[PDB]
């Protein structure tokens, strides 16, 4: 007798999915929505390459630590790679004010142009040729100082005079700049370097005012210094002018950065991974992803277009039917 039957597809598939009603269900066709593969390296993005701070910290780089000469000058970057146990940062002991807001502001950028903001010329009646210390050595001179700052002291002869400096930002770009205030360990060194008198460091901009006086005290020795420097930063906006004025204890700005900010969003990666000559559209702290998948369980930190991060190990959607072969 003639037979006709109704039925459905099967194959040698063993790929399983889960449902609310049943776990481990074999189906004929499925699709994985989640990526968990990664090249373990850093690649360029928008073909712009990252900035490897190597054996420097952001602090070291942007203050101009002598041992960070490698990084000196102009820099372009798609993102920033800080290695976890980089040793060259703040050589001469002291606190960098608003460090976290600085590390974040720098992140929001993509290029800097180094430029002499205040020539040593600027400061009248003072010795800009000393201002050097073994807490801050180079690789060739075990007594140096930051490349973007000047430690101004009194001349052999005279009195530490009132000193003034001004800079009108006539350019199109905001300027990131730095200064400091020296806090000697005792009165003896205060007098040697800057002289008698109540000393001050004052700064001014259309939008901000800074003022501080030296805080003299011996503090625990760090790199053989029981003195300190309080470091500061700011952003001189386009059109604004900066006025400096002090009668002592000023670590003056010397070089500064013309800062162009990205309206992407940048990133600062603390990692051990190598930087290699490759492109990428998605780069995570733990590696680049190459995929069209919409989910990923690698890492929640990235730049570029990455898939949504989740804690699933698999997200497999069933497309075919139950497999019964």
């Amino acid at each position: 007798s003639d037979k006709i039957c109704i039925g459905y597809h099967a194959n040698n598939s063993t790929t399983q999915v889960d449902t609310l009603l049943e776990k481990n269900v074999t189906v004929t066709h499925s699709v994985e929505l989640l990526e968990n593969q990664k090249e373990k390296r850093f690649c360029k993005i928008m073909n712009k390459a990252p900035l490897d701070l190597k054996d420097c910290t952001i602090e070291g780089w942007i203050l101009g630590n002598p041992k960070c000469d490698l990084l000196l000058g102009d820099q372009s970057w798609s993102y920033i790679v800080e290695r976890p146990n980089a040793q060259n940062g703040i050589c001469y002991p002291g606190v960098l004010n608003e460090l976290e807001e600085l590390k974040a502001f720098i992140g929001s950028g993509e290029r800097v142009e180094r430029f002499e903001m205040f020539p040593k010329s600027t400061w009248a009646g003072v010795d800009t040729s000393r201002g050097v210390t073994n807490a801050c050595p180079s690789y060739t001179i075990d007594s140096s100082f930051y490349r973007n700052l000047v430690w101004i002291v009194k001349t052999d002869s005279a009195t530490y005079p009132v000193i003034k400096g001004t800079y009108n930002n006539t350019g199109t770009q905001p300027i990131l700049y730095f200064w400091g205030v020296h806090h000697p360990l005792d009165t003896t060194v205060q007098d040697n370097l800057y002289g008698s008198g109540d000393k001050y460091v004052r700064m001014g901009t259309e939008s901000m005012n800074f003022a501080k006086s030296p805080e003299i005290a011996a503090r625990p020795a760090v790199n053989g210094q029981r003195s300190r420097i309080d470091y500061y930063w700011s952003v001189l906006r386009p059109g604004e002018t900066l006025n400096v004025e002090s009668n002592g204890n000023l670590i003056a700005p010397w070089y500064a950065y013309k800062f162009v900010s990205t309206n992407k969003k940048g990133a600062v990666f603390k990692s051990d991974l190598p930087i290699e000559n490759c492109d990428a559209t998605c780069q995570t702290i733990t590696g680049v992803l190459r995929t069209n998948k919409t989910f990923q369980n690698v890492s929640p930190l990235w730049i570029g277009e990455c898939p949504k991060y989740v804690k699933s190990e698999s997200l497999r959607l069933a497309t075919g039917l139950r497999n019964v072969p």
């Binding site: 039925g7 597809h9 929505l33 699933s312 069933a318």
Partner: protein, 168 residues
């Protein structure tokens, strides 16, 4: 399976049927074999594809966590940032893991459903002219050649022309 057809009053599928998801086994004097129903298969493919692409499309945003550091005097906002980023992570993880679980359940139902409707399509034509056997199959009470086999598959059988022989 919820419609009862797949695994099943029709236990097991056909590895022999390669050209589709749902279809027919025929056997007659002229031979035998397997043939998919592409209309029901294709509109299923379009369905599932649209489902997958919809899910993909609707899931096509990303929450973005961030580098930023916090001082020892910033435990509170620090922890606030941590709680927020974990918060969205746990939410999206839930949304994705459960959506998969749900849609997979309903996807199987659809296939189950489409098979059943094929079974009843054929049963609606043959009637008296066939013995069921209640497992997807149909024994003809008459002689069904290949033009008759297509008759059943294109949904144009003709119960009148084989009523004669079926009684007998």
């Amino acid at each position: 399976g919820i419609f009862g057809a797949i695994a099943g009053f029709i236990e097991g599928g056909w590895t022999g049927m390669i050209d589709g998801w749902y279809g027919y086994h025929h056997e007659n004097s002229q031979g035998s074999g397997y043939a998919a129903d592409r209309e029901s298969t294709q509109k299923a493919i379009d369905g599932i594809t649209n489902k997958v692409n919809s899910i993909i499309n609707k899931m096509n945003t990303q929450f973005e966590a961030v580098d930023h550091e916090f001082s020892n005097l910033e435990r509170r906002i620090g922890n606030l940032n941590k709680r927020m980023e974990d918060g969205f992570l746990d939410v999206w993880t839930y949304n994705a893991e459960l959506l998969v679980l749900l849609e997979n359940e309903r996807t199987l139902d659809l296939h189950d459903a489409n098979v059943k409707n094929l079974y009843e399509k054929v049963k609606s034509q043959l009637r008296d002219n066939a013995n069921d056997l209640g497992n997807g199959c149909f024994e003809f009470w008459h002689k069904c050649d290949n033009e008759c086999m297509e008759s059943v598959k294109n949904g144009t059988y003709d119960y009148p022309k084989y009523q004669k022989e079926s009684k007998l």
